[PDB]
């Protein structure tokens, strides 16, 4: 695994260089499933780069990538060394030049995540973690916050990709329950990976969301657990990479409390 | 006014250094009017520092500061040279080490903002604007985005300091109307002054909020207009620095469209 990991880091860093030049040029903005689900030619270009480079040195391995699944590929995770890639987490941010866009590379062996690389381009911050070895941002070790009281916590979440009134009302209703506990506040920078990395640095205490996909959270989940945090399903049960739901918190006390307060939204899983 | 402005940029960088050393330490958080309305000793220290230094060089000048008003001073704006200060915009972010924290200085003469300085401490980004002279971030000229189509905008807003069931429901109800137009998304970085500065850079298209105060928006408002944007009331009327409500937008087509969808919350003015 370490050989794979340091290749992943040189790859994440050059894919990030591509994204950072592209953000300052004109862009072709295209639509995937709706007027608000967006893709650009840079997304597709970076995933092609990443998957071809990895196949070259590791032909035996599997790949789950956002744009590949958009081009009809499948997201079923098997025990084979799988690379789970999102070339640009933050495409809406990227299109707008809102300054938070990340490349996320997650690696799973036996359906368990072994390492994660998340590179935030505009900030120039590389976050990395390998199981048992700690979580880092540009060499500095990270640790989650120590907060255990929900009325003193700062949470991060997103409003989601749907615009169906009933799903939207459920998202907002869940934000209302949390907000009125009361919590100190809720933030949204626009990318699931960066939201989870801010939890790993201790800047936020918890992140929760329903509607994400495995490629958005694969790389950052292990940066959270290796910074001392916790991953959990919104049922309060164990985290399932393919279920489209995640609570990533500094500790089990806040995660359980968030799960107790929010209601599950119906969604198709990534392996269905 | 240019000498005042050169001084004011020196002060903001100094105060900003105080805030950035202070963020790395343990803090005693105090409460003001509710359990989510926070203040720390640094808020007060940086504010008394800013007013002492300016009052040394400029003894005829008036001041509106957040903690000074919290200490019984009055928020009235007259045609006198007035410095409008918030020592730390983003106290809740400061407390959690969530990295968007700003020092803000607006200077008004004849009740009109002449110049404004906002220093985002943890990023090391100094934003400045002088009427008729343009807005800059660290020496780089800024320009708002060109978007005139609401269904393709990215908006920033906050969830507000109130936690009264009714007000929270109107804030979220207003947010649901805009979300469902649709728009591309909504972000919240935790501070009025940095949210407005992201509109000035073209990274977001508009910012709206009700419940803010004249010290939160005095420094950043001039930066948005000198970058090519407009400030307006949520009612569509003229922007009033004391009415607790603002739309800072790239242009009047987007600002008026946002004013159409959202409903006003009754608020108690700053000058009463
Ligand atoms: Ca993506
Ligand atoms: Ca403040």
Curated annotation (Swiss-Prot), chains A, B:
GO terms for molecular function: fructose-1-phosphatase activity; glucose-1-phosphatase activity; glucose-6-phosphatase activity; glycerol-2-phosphatase activity; identical protein binding; inositol monophosphate 1-phosphatase activity; inositol monophosphate 3-phosphatase activity; inositol monophosphate 4-phosphatase activity. It is found in: Cytoplasm. Optimum pH is 7.0-7.5. The modification Phosphothreonine is found at residue 164. Mg(2+) 2 binds at residues 86, 89, 216. Keywords: Cytoplasm, Hydrolase, Intellectual disability, Lithium, Magnesium, Metal-binding, Phosphoprotein. Its EC number is 3.1.3.25, 3.1.3.94. Its main location: cytoplasm. Mg(2+) 1 binds at residues 66, 86, 88. It catalyses: a myo-inositol phosphate + H2O = myo-inositol + phosphate; 1D-myo-inositol 1-phosphate + H2O = myo-inositol + phosphate; 1D-myo-inositol 2-phosphate + H2O = myo-inositol + phosphate; 1D-myo-inositol 3-phosphate + H2O = myo-inositol + phosphate. Activity with myo-inositol monophosphates and D-galactose 1-phosphate is inhibited by Li(+), Ca(2+) and Mn(2+), but also by Mg(2+) at concentrations above 3 mM. The keyword Metal-binding applies. GO terms for cellular component: cytoplasm; cytosol. Its cofactor is Mg(2+). Substrate binds at residues 66, 88-91, 190-192, 209, 216. SUPFAM superfamilies: Carbohydrate phosphatase. GO terms for biological process: inositol biosynthetic process; inositol metabolic process; phosphate-containing compound metabolic process; phosphatidylinositol biosynthetic process; phosphatidylinositol phosphate biosynthetic process; signal transduction. The keyword Phosphoprotein applies. It holds the Pfam family Inositol_P. It is linked to Intellectual developmental disorder, autosomal recessive 59: A disorder characterized by significantly below average general intellectual functioning associated with impairments in adaptive behavior and manifested during the developmental period. Homodimer. Belongs to the inositol monophosphatase superfamily. Phosphatase involved in the dephosphorylation of myo-inositol monophosphates to generate myo-inositol. Is also able to dephosphorylate scyllo-inositol-phosphate, myo-inositol 1,4-diphosphate, scyllo-inositol-1,3-diphosphate and scyllo-inositol-1,4-diphosphate. Also dephosphorylates in vitro other sugar-phosphates including D-galactose-1-phosphate, glucose-1-phosphate, glucose-6-phosphate, fructose-1-phosphate, beta-glycerophosphate and 2'-AMP. This is Inositol monophosphatase 1. The gene is IMPA1.
């Amino acid at each position: 695994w370490q050989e794979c990991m340091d290749y992943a880091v040189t790859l994440a860093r050059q894919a990030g260089e591509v994204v950072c030049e592209a953000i300052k040029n004109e862009m072709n903005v295209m639509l995937k499933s709706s007027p608000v689900d967006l893709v650009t030619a840079t997304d597709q270009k970076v995933e092609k780069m990443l998957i071809s480079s990895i196949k070259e040195k590791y032909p035996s391995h599997s790949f789950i990538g956002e744009e590949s699944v958009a081009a009809g590929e499948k997201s079923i995770l098997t025990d084979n060394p799988t690379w789970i890639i999102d070339p640009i987490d933050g495409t809406t941010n990227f299109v707008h030049r809102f300054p938070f866009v990340a490349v996320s590379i997650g690696f799973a062996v036996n359906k368990k995540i072994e390492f994660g690389v998340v590179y935030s381009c505009v900030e120039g911050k590389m976050y990395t973690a390998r199981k048992g070895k700690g979580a880092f941002c540009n060499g500095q070790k990270l640790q989650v916050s120590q907060q255990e009281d929900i009325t003193k916590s700062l949470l991060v979440t997103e409003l989601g990709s749907s615009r169906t009134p009933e799903t939207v009302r459920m998202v907002l209703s869940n934000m209302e329950k949390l907000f009125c506990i009361p919590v100190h506040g809720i933030r949204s920078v626009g990318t699931a990976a960066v939201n989870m990395c801010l939890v790993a640095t201790g800047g936020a205490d918890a992140y929760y969301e329903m509607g994400i996909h495995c490629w958005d959270v694969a790389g950052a989940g292990i940066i959270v657990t290796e910074a001392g945090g916790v991953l959990m399903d919104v049922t309060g049960g164990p985290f399932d990479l393919m279920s489209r739901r995640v609570i990533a918190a500094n500790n089990r006390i806040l995660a359980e409390r968030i799960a107790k307060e929010i209601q599950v939204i119906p969604l198709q899983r990534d392996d269905e």
